[PDB]
Structures are given as structure tokens and as C-alpha cells.
Amino acid sequence: RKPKTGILMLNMGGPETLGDVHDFLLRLFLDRDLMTLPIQNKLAPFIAKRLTPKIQEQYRRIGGGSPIKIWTSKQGEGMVKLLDELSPNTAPHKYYIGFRYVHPLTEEAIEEMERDGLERAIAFTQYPQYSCSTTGSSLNAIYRYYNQVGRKPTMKWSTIDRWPTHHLLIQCFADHILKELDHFPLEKRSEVVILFSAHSLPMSVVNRGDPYPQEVSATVQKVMERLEYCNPYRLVWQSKVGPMPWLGPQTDESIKGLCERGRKNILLVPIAFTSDHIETLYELDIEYSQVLAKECGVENIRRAESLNGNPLFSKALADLVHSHIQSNELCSKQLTLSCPLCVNPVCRETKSFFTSQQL
Amino acid sequence: RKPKTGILMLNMGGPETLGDVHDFLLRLFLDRDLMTLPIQNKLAPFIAKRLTPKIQEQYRRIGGGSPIKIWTSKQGEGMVKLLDELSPNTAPHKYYIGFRYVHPLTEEAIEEMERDGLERAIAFTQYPQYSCSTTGSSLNAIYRYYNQVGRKPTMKWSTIDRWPTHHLLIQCFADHILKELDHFPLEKRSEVVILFSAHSLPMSVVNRGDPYPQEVSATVQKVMERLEYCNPYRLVWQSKVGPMPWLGPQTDESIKGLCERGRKNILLVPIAFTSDHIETLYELDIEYSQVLAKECGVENIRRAESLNGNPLFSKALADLVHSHIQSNELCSKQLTLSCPLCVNPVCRETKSFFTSQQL
Ligand SMILES: C[C@H](CCC(=O)O)[C@H]1CC[C@H]2[C@@H]3[C@H](O)C[C@@H]4C[C@H](O)CC[C@]4(C)[C@H]3C[C@H](O)[C@]12C
Ligand SMILES: C[C@H](CCC(=O)O)[C@H]1CC[C@H]2[C@@H]3[C@H](O)C[C@@H]4C[C@H](O)CC[C@]4(C)[C@H]3C[C@H](O)[C@]12C
Ligand SMILES: C[C@H](CCC(=O)O)[C@H]1CC[C@H]2[C@@H]3[C@H](O)C[C@@H]4C[C@H](O)CC[C@]4(C)[C@H]3C[C@H](O)[C@]12C
Ligand SMILES: C[C@H](CCC(=O)O)[C@H]1CC[C@H]2[C@@H]3[C@H](O)C[C@@H]4C[C@H](O)CC[C@]4(C)[C@H]3C[C@H](O)[C@]12C
Ligand SMILES: C[C@H](CCC(=O)O)[C@H]1CC[C@H]2[C@@H]3[C@H](O)C[C@@H]4C[C@H](O)CC[C@]4(C)[C@H]3C[C@H](O)[C@]12C
Ligand SMILES: C[C@H](CCC(=O)O)[C@H]1CC[C@H]2[C@@H]3[C@H](O)C[C@@H]4C[C@H](O)CC[C@]4(C)[C@H]3C[C@H](O)[C@]12C
Ligand code: FES
Ligand code: FES
Ligand SMILES: [Cl-]
Ligand SMILES: [Cl-]
Numbered sequence: 268r269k270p271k272t273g274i275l276m277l278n279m280g281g282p283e284t285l286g287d288v289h290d291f292l293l294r295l296f297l298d299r300d301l302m303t304l305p306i307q308n309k310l311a312p313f314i315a316k317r318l319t320p321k322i323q324e325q326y327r328r329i330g331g332g333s334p335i336k337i338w339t340s341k342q343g344e345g346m347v348k349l350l351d352e353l354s355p356n357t358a359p360h361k362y363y364i365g366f367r368y369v370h371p372l373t374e375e376a377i378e379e380m381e382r383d384g385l386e387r388a389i390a391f392t393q394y395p396q397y398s399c400s401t402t403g404s405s406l407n408a409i410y411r412y413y414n415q416v417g418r419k420p421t422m423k424w425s426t427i428d429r430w431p432t433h434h435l436l437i438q439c440f441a442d443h444i445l446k447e448l449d450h451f452p453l454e455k456r457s458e459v460v461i462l463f464s465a466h467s468l469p470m471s472v473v474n475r476g477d478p479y480p481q482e483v484s485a486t487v488q489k490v491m492e493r494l495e496y497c498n499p500y501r502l503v504w505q506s507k508v509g510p511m512p513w514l515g516p517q518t519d520e521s522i523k524g525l526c527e528r529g530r531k532n533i534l535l536v537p538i539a540f541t542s543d544h545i546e547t548l549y550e551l552d553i554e555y556s557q558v559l560a561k562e563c564g565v566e567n568i569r570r571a572e573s574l575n576g577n578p579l580f581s582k583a584l585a586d587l588v589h590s591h592i593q594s595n596e597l598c599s600k601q602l603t604l605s606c607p608l609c610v611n612p613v614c615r616e617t618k619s620f621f622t623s624q625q626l
Numbered sequence: 627r628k629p630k631t632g633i634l635m636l637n638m639g640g641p642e643t644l645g646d647v648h649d650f651l652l653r654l655f656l657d658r659d660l661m662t663l664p665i666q667n668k669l670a671p672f673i674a675k676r677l678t679p680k681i682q683e684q685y686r687r688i689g690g691g692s693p694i695k696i697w698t699s700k701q702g703e704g705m706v707k708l709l710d711e712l713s714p715n716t717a718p719h720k721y722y723i724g725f726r727y728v729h730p731l732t733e734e735a736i737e738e739m740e741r742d743g744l745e746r747a748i749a750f751t752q753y754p755q756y757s758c759s760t761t762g763s764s765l766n767a768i769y770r771y772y773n774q775v776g777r778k779p780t781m782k783w784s785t786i787d788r789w790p791t792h793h794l795l796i797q798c799f800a801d802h803i804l805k806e807l808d809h810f811p812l813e814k815r816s817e818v819v820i821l822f823s824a825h826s827l828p829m830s831v832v833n834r835g836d837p838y839p840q841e842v843s844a845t846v847q848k849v850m851e852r853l854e855y856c857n858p859y860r861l862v863w864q865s866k867v868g869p870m871p872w873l874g875p876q877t878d879e880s881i882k883g884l885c886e887r888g889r890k891n892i893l894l895v896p897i898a899f900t901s902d903h904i905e906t907l908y909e910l911d912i913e914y915s916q917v918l919a920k921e922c923g924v925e926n927i928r929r930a931e932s933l934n935g936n937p938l939f940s941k942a943l944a945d946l947v948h949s950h951i952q953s954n955e956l957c958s959k960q961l962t963l964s965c966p967l968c969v970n971p972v973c974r975e976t977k978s979f980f981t982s983q984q985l
Contacts, residue, residue: 432847460963470829474874476883481861484843488791499963502840512871515833516966524835524966604819604858607875607883 270361273385273422274350274588275376276343277405278393280366281333281544285323287369292318294368300407300613301400329548338542338575339364339393345581346588353589357387360588365405373408381421389588390426390621395436396465396486396539397429398479399606400472403614410617424624425597427587431482432489435583439574440486440538441493447534447571448498455567459498459532460525462518463487465539466546467504470512476606480514483539490538502538505550519555526563535570541580543573597624629720632744632781633709633947634735635702636764637752639725640692640903644682646728648674651681653727659766659972660759688907697901697934698723698752704940705947712948716746719947724764732767733774740780748947749785749980754795755824755845755898756788757838758965758973759831769976783983784956786946790841791848794942798933799845799897800852806893806930807857814891814926818857819884821877822846824898825905826863829871835965839873842898849897861897864909878914882922890925900933956983 282291295301296311304310326332343362350360361383365376380388390409392402406426413420430436444461451459465483473480487502505518516524518535525533535556537547551570560568574580598621605614641650654660655670663669685691702721709719720742724735739747749768751761765785772779789795803820810818824842832839846861864877875883877894884892896906910929918924933939957980964973 432851470871470874474876476860476862476875476880478860480839481843481846484840485847487840488844488847492791496959499959501835501837501963501966503835503966512829515829516835517833521835521966524968528964528966528968530963530966600855600858604860604889605887607860607862607880607887607889609883609887 268359270359270383270385272350272357272360272387272389272592273380273383274343274346274360274362274389274391275365275373275380276339276362276391276393277365277373277402278335278339278367279401279404280369281335282326282369283336284332285326287332288323288326289315289319291368292322298367298404300611301404325545325549328553329545333544334548335542335544336364336366338573341576342542342581342584345578346584349582349585350588353585354592357592361385365408367405367408373405374412377409377412385422388420388422388424389591390424390428391584391588392426392428393541394539395429395433395541396431396479396482397601398468398472399477399609399611399614400468401479402428403617406621407613407617410613410620413620423626424621425591426602426621427591428599428602429482430587431486433583433587435579435586437486437489437493439577439580439583440490440536440571442579443571443574443577444490444494444534444536447569450569451532451534451567455532457498458530459534459567460530461498461500461534461536462521462525463490463500463502463536463538464505464518464551465502465537466506467513467515467517469509470514473514475608475610478601478606486538490536498534506546518551519559522555522565522568523559523563526560526565531564531566533565533568535568537571537573541574543575547573595626597621597626627718629718629742629744631709631716631719631746631748631951632739632742633702633705633719633721633748633750634724634732634739635698635721635750635752636724636732636761637694637698637726638760638763639728640694641685641728642695643691644685646691647682647685648678650728651677657727657763659970660763684904684908687912688904692903693907694901694903695723695725697932700935701901701940701943704937705943708941708944709947712944713951716951720744724767726764726767732764733771736768736771744781747779747781747783748950749783749787750943750947751785751787752900753898754788754792754900755790755838755841756960757827757836758968758970759827759836760838761787762973762976765980766972766976769972769979772979782985783980784950785961785980786950787958787961788841789946790845792942792946794938794945795900796845796848796852798936798939798942799849799895799930801938802930802933802936803849803853803893803895806928809928810891810893810926816857817889818891818893819889820857820859820893820895821880821884822849822859822861822895822897823864823877823910824861824896825865826872826874826876828868829873832873834967834969837960837965845897857893865905877910878917881914881924881927882918885918885922885924890923892924892927894927894929896929896932900939902932902934906932954985956980956985
């Protein structure tokens with residue numbers, strides 16, 4: 268049975284091995300839609316080379332590479348198995364991985380999808396909360412692919428561009444939080460502070476209208492609602508780099524602040540990504556929770572398990588796709604509104620690519 | 627019959643008449659918890675007099691004063707009537723207004739509550755979303771009052787310190803949004819962009835861990851969920867003053883950005899306050915209308931009606947108080963966690979004041 272419906276799982280991706288680091292960075296610094304640099308074609312290769320050593324070291328510290336593809340594949344496999352039973356009218360389903368800066372690239376995935384002669388293609392972002400710098404960037408790649416190939420799609424496209432409050436996603440987070448709370452000494456469980464952590468954004472991006480912060484906040488509220496506000500919490504942000512202003516509080520400074528104020532039992536909850544990656548395995552676990560935590564004299568700091576291979580998460584993915592198919596929606600209503608201060612002409616073209624699709 | 631349960635409605639307040647402006651500003655600039663100024667006792671009076679003319683002019687433009695007390699009283703009376711019926715066991719109920727910078731001052735209300743010989747006192751903030759600079763400030767006033775007079779409370783205290791997603795509050799916002807959408811030309815309704823607007827915060831405050839942005843974001847999500855995402859939206863922020871960085875996007879810059887990009891049908895929705903005040907009647911209705919207008923001409927820009935005297939809102943207030951009474955809660959779990967980077971000694975003392983109250 269030839270594939271009928273293709274589910275393109277979009278994510279930035281991460282280098283699988285240390286040798287993949289350089290090209291990962293090179294592709295990223297060459298993404299004119301992601302950032303604008305003077306003589307970019309000359310500086311991109313240079314910046315990539317200068318950052319490679321330190322980044323390779325970070326990946327070495329976590330085993331030698333990113334586990335994103337392994338987790339994405341497991342989730343994709345599980346999603347497809349469920350879909351073939353859930354939606355027989357659109358079966359057989361096939362998942363395709365479309366990483367923005369590593370193989371398989373978004374472009375390579377689309378090429379394969381077209382070759383397979385699919386009837387429908389669904390751009391399914393793996394970021395539950397929409398940022399023009401994450402999901403937007405991947406959707407732009409799809410639009411740009413067809414414009415560069417000078418050909419129109421031979422498949423009918425649509426996108427699941429965000430899903431910050433899907434009930435099963437919320438259930439997965441709540442479940443993982445409860446199981447991690449069970450790992451704290453019973454006597455300290457009620458005193459545990461939950462720090463939801465998500466990749467930060469530069470204020471220049473937040474200030475133009477990026478919908479990310481508000482959606483991440485929505486995910487946090489739903490999770491706490493399901494947990495019946497059992498513990499106190501704060502939503503903080505990690506991964507800031509450079510001297511420019513970014514959205515705070517910073518996760519590292521918040522952990523230190525809490526410890527210095529007597530709150531030494533902390534549960535970190537990555538709330539904007541669904542698998543382990545450099546942000547959790549290195550930044551939170553090693554950079555912070557090993558150098559900071561100790562130096563601050565904390566009692567117990569743990570991190571909720573990433574969704575990774577949780578079967579319930581695969582069900583969440585399948586239900587999202589199933590509902591999307593049955594609704595006949597081309598994209599979210601939110602995608603039809605670009606940032607009030609957007610200055611990137613590709614955003615409007617990408618939005619139109621999806622809203623104009625033949626049904 | 628003598629009152630048994632007192633509900634202290636907390637809000638910053640606004641000057642009732644132009645003559646009240648000076649002292650309004652004076653009390654605000656003297657509040658060392660809200661801000662630290664060099665030789666504050668000398669500069670506070672000066673800055674107050676310096677800004678009085680400009681602020682008086684703003685109020686003159688909206689009729690001569692703030693309507694906050696009138697709306698609060700109307701809401702309070704409606705709330706009490708419902709409470710006497712909902713909770714006979716805690717009746718009679720009596721509402722008291724406790725404004726932070728204008729009469730009746732928080733301190734004056736507490737004095738009256740104690741004179742009335744109440745058995746129970748509930749600090750009910752009128753800000754659905756918690757900010758250490760709004761609700762926190764009001765709660766500090768209560769703690770400091772008893773620290774000032776030098777004597778323990780003669781009433782049993784508790785607080786409803788936040789309620790960002792109360793189901794009836796959400797219904798009120800949704801109802802008001804739908805009623806305003808019905809005022810747009812039918813052919814442009816679907817084109818209408820919803821801009822939720824809330825008072826901004828300096829980034830220095832956001833970065834220390836203020837819970838406000840995340841809670842406002844939660845309110846927005848719940849409202850859009852009830853509206854079934856009928857229109858696209860963005861949460862933006864207003865009222866920034868000074869040269870320092872504040873949380874954006876700014877509401878005015880967003881309206882201008884939208885208009886310049888073709889979205890000339892906008893619905894403004896004040897989402898962090900429940901009555902009309904300077905922010906809606908002057909800033910949104912007048913200032914923005916005059917600042918824009920030219921060149922980039924808007925087609926239709928309307929503002930959803932503030933909750934004000936909506937009887938459903940009164941029901942929301944009573945439901946909140948009733949549920950609070952039934953649960954025996956002293957405060958939200960969130961209040962038990964101060965900002966990770968809080969540097970104000972009073973915050974912890976205020977928290978303890980409420981968590982330690984005798985039942
Ligand atoms: C000017 C540009 C900022 C783009 C903008 O937001 O306006 C910044 C971003 C990346 C910067 C470069 C990177 O930080 C890499 C180099 C760092 C060296 O210390 C200076 C040259 C160096 C080659 C930088 C030149 C310049 O400051 C760049 C190119
Ligand atoms: C800040 C930006 C998202 C918002 C924006 O579009 O500006 C994000 C998207 C991808 C991120 C980059 C990638 O994660 C690759 C690098 C990871 C390193 O740990 C920091 C630098 C690094 C080069 C990151 C800088 C910055 O955090 C990026 C560029
Ligand atoms: C840290 C890295 C330079 C590597 C190094 O020289 O050590 C620089 C190079 C390109 C920079 C990015 C680009 O200038 C694009 C963005 C510019 C914004 O003002 C800040 C975030 C922003 C996303 C920058 C983050 C960071 O300063 C980067 C990623
Ligand atoms: C130094 C202090 C900032 C303290 C803080 O971070 O809150 C700032 C806040 C308000 C400022 C004052 C107000 O802007 C009023 C005056 C404005 C004049 O241009 C200078 C003196 C003037 C009297 C200012 C002195 C100084 O810049 C102040 C006092
Ligand atoms: C920024 C601050 C809230 C966060 C904080 O604590 O810094 C808020 C609380 C009360 C606000 C002030 C009050 O609304 C009174 C004044 C209103 C005027 O329109 C602007 C200046 C004005 C003097 C405001 C400045 C600023 O927006 C304040 C001081
Ligand atoms: C606008 C007003 C008066 C300026 C002047 O008339 O010269 C000034 C005086 C006190 C200032 C505030 C105080 O300095 C306290 C805060 C300091 C933060 O860095 C910005 C917001 C902040 C809340 C300030 C907002 C604004 O600059 C204020 C409210
Ligand atoms: S930057 Fe957000 S739509 Fe373009
Ligand atoms: S400033 Fe937020 S608790 Fe003190
Ligand atoms: Cl990674
Ligand atoms: Cl007012």
C-alpha cells in the first residue's frame with residue numbers, strides 16, 4: 268500500500284554527532300529569515316567555525332550528540348500506527364522528519380514526500396507554542412522550497428502550526444511532574460517550587476509581537492490547573508546568549524535566587540519542547556544543576572522527564588492530526604495574523620501559502 | 627443587624643476630582659515599596675506637583691475624574707446582596723473600599739472594619755492577575771497597618787489574591803467582546819483583529835519574577851477558548867512611561883503596525899482591569915485616537931465595554947468570595963512563593979501575615 272497522507276514533523280533539530288556541529292551552525296547562520304548579518308555569506312561560515320569547538324564540547328558532555336532524531340522517530344512511528352487505525356480514510360499514513368538545520372532537512376523531506384506521490388501533506392510543527400523563530404521558520408522553509416524549485420505542490424498542504432493547550436499534551440506534562448514530585452522526600456514534597464522553563468526570546472522579538480510568550484504561559488496555566496495548584500510556580504526562561512536584552516526571569520538566576528531565599532527544593536519543568544535535547548541534558552542538567560545548584564547549597568533540584576517515548580504523547584500527536592484532518596482546517600486562526608510589527612516579507616507569503624491551499 | 631463578614635475591595639484607585647490629583651501622586655511617590663528615590667521625602671512632593679497639571683488635564687479630558695469608586699461601589703453592593711443569600715452563615719456581609727493612593731485609603735477601611743467589630747475580613751484584590759506592584763502593594767498596606775498601629779488584628783483575615791481564570795470573569799469578557807464585534811460592519815467582522823491590552827511592567831520588574839505576565843496570558847487564553855478562536859489576537863501592553871525598557875509589544879505601536887500592514891479593523895480589549903479608568907477612557911479612547919488618525923487611517927477601531935455594572939460580574943465577585951469562604955483558604959498557593967529575585971523584605975512578612983492567620 269502506497270502512502271496517502273504524509274505527516275511532516277518539523278523541528279530545528281540538533282547535530283547527531285560532534286562532526287555534524289559545524290554544518291548545523293553554518294545552516295543556521297545562513298538562514299536570512301532567522302537573522303540578518305552583514306556580509307552574511309562570509310560571516311556565517313566564520314561564526315560557525317568559531318563556535319564549533321565549544322558546542323562540540325557541550326554535546327560531548329551529554330554523550331556525543333543530540334537525541335532529537337531518535338525521539339522524533341519513536342514518536343512519529345507511534346503516531347502513524349495509531350493514525351492508520353484512527354483515520355482509515357486517509358491511511359496509510361507516513362511520517363517524515365523535517366529538521367531546519369540538520370539532515371534530514373525540511374527540503375529533503377518535501378522532496379521525498381513529493382516523490383512518494385502523497386495526496387495530502389501536513390506540516391506538523393513539534394513546537395507546541397508558536398514562535399516566528401521556531402515554527403514560523405520551518406513553515407517559511409516549505410514556502411521557499413516551492414518558490415526555489417519553480418514548481419507548485421503536487422500534494423494538498425495544511426498545517427498544525429500550534430497546539431499549546433492540547434489536553435493530552437497537558438496530561439503528559441502533569442503526569443511527568445507528578446512522578447518527579449514522588450521522587451522528592453515526602454517531607455519536602457509540599458515545599459517544592461515548580462520552575463517551568465522555556466527557551467527565551469530576545470526582547471526585540473517579543474516586542475514585535477511574537478505570540479510565543481503568551482502561548483507558553485497558557486500551557487503553564489493548563490498544567491497547573493490539572494495539578495490543582497498543588498505547588499507554587501513561576502515561568503522562567505533559559506538559553507539567553509549575547510549582551511542584548513532577552514525575556515526574563517532567567518532560569519539560572521531564578522534557581523540561584525530561590526536557593527538564596529531559602530527555597531532549596533526545586534522541580535524544573537521544560538515546558539516548550541517535547542524531547543530531551545541540549546537544553547535539558549546539558550544546560551539544565553550540567554551547566555546549571557551541577558555547577559550552580561551545588562555552589563548555591565540546594566537540597567533537592569530535579570528535572571521532570573521529557574515526554575520522549577511516552578505512549579500517551581504519541582496518542583496526543585495522533586489525536587492532533589486526526590482532529591486536524593476531520594476539521595478540514597488549513598491552519599490556525601492565529602496564523603492568519605502576522606506580528607503587528609513584523610518586518611519580514613516572507614511571513615505574509617508563507618501565511619498565504621497555507622490559507623490559499625486547494626481544499 | 628451588625629455586619630459579620632467584611633469584604634475589603636482593593637485597588638490602587640484614581641482621583642475622583644481634579645483637586646485630588648496632587649495627593650494621589652504624592653502618596654504614590656512616597657511609597658518606598660513601589661519605588662526608591664533619592665531624598666524621596668523632598669522629591670515625592672515635588673514630582674507630584676510637577677505632574678499634577680498634566681495628569682489633571684488627562685482627567686479633565688474624561689469628564690473631570692476617575693469613575694473607579696462609583697463602579698467599585700456598584701459592584702460591591704451587588705456582590706454583598708448575593709453573598710447574604712449564598713452564605714447565610716457568614717451574613718451580614720459588608721463591602722469596604724480600600725484604595726492604595728486615594729480616599730478611602732486601605733488604612734482607613736481597615737480602621738472602619740475593626741470598629742464595626744467584624745469577625746471575618748477578606749482582602750479581595752480587584753486585579754484578577756497578580757503583580758507585586760498592584761495586589762502585592764495592597765496586601766503590604768494591610769500588613770504594615772497592623773505593624774504601624776502596633777497591635778494584632780481583631781478580625782480573622784484571609785485573602786483572594788488572584789483570580790485570572792475565574793469562569794464567570796471569563797464569561798463576562800467573552801460576552802463583552804462578542805457584543806462589540808456585533809458593532810463592526812458585518813463585512814469586516816471576520817477581518818477584525820483582537821488586541822488584548824494590559825498595563826505593562828518595566829522589564830526590571832518582569833525579570834525579577836513578577837507573576838503578572840503569565841497570569842494575564844492565562845486570562846487571554848481562557849477568553850479565546852470560550853470564543854472558540856473566532857478571530858485572531860495578540861496580547862499587547864500599554865501605559866509605559868520613561869526611557870527604561872518595559873514589556874512589549876506596546877499597544878499603541880501595535881495598533882499603528884497593524885494599520886500600516888493592512889489590518890485596519892481592530893477590537894481593543896482591556897484584559898487586566900474590571901472597570902473604566904484612566905487607561906480605557908483616556909489612554910485607549912483619546913490619546914491613541916489622536917496619536918494615530920493621520921496617514922495610516924484605521925477603518926474601524928473599537929474598544930470592548932469594561933465590565934463595570936454588568937450583573938454577571940457582580941455574580942462572579944460573589945462566587946469568588948463564597949468559594950473562598952467554603953474552602954477555608956487563607957490565600958492562594960501562589961502567594962506562598964515570593965519572586966525568585968525579590969529584594970523587598972516586606973513581601974515575605976506580608977505573605978506570613980496571611981498564611982499565619984488564625985482560622
Ligand atoms: C552587527 C551584527 C548585529 C546585527 C544587527 O542586529 O543589527 C553583529 C551580530 C554578530 C556579530 C559578530 C559576532 O559576534 C562574531 C564576531 C565577534 C567579535 O568580537 C567582533 C566581530 C564579529 C565578527 C561580530 C561583528 C558584529 O558585532 C556582528 C556581525
Ligand atoms: C534567539 C533565536 C530565536 C529568536 C530570534 O529569531 O532571534 C535562537 C534560534 C536558534 C538559536 C541558536 C541555536 O540553538 C544554535 C546555538 C546554540 C548555543 O547554545 C547558543 C548559540 C546558538 C547559535 C543559538 C542562538 C539563539 O538562541 C538562537 C539563534
Ligand atoms: C553568540 C553568537 C556569536 C558567537 C561568538 O562570537 O562567541 C552571536 C552571533 C549571531 C548573534 C545573533 C544575531 O545577531 C541575531 C539576533 C540579534 C538580537 O539583537 C539578539 C539575538 C540574536 C539571535 C543574536 C544572538 C547572539 O548574539 C549571536 C547568536
Ligand atoms: C534617580 C531616580 C531613579 C531611581 C530609580 O531607579 O527608581 C530618578 C527617578 C525620578 C527622577 C527625577 C524626575 O524625572 C523629575 C526631575 C526631572 C529633571 O529633568 C531632572 C531632575 C528630576 C528631579 C529627576 C532626578 C532623577 O533623575 C530621578 C529622581
Ligand atoms: C510601573 C509601576 C508598576 C511596576 C512597578 O512597581 O515598577 C506603575 C504603578 C503605578 C503607576 C503610576 C500611576 O498610574 C500614576 C501615574 C499615571 C501616569 O499616566 C503615568 C505616571 C504615573 C506616575 C504611573 C507610573 C507607573 O506606570 C506606575 C508607577
Ligand atoms: C514619569 C515620572 C516623572 C518624570 C518627570 O516628570 O520628570 C517618573 C518619576 C518616577 C519614575 C519611576 C521610578 O523611577 C520607579 C521605576 C524605575 C524603573 O527603572 C522604570 C519604571 C519606574 C516605575 C519609573 C517610571 C517613570 O520614569 C517615573 C514614574
Ligand atoms: S515576525 Fe512574526 S509574523 Fe513575521
Ligand atoms: S517583588 Fe515579588 S514577592 Fe517581592
Ligand atoms: Cl540538541
Ligand atoms: Cl483612574
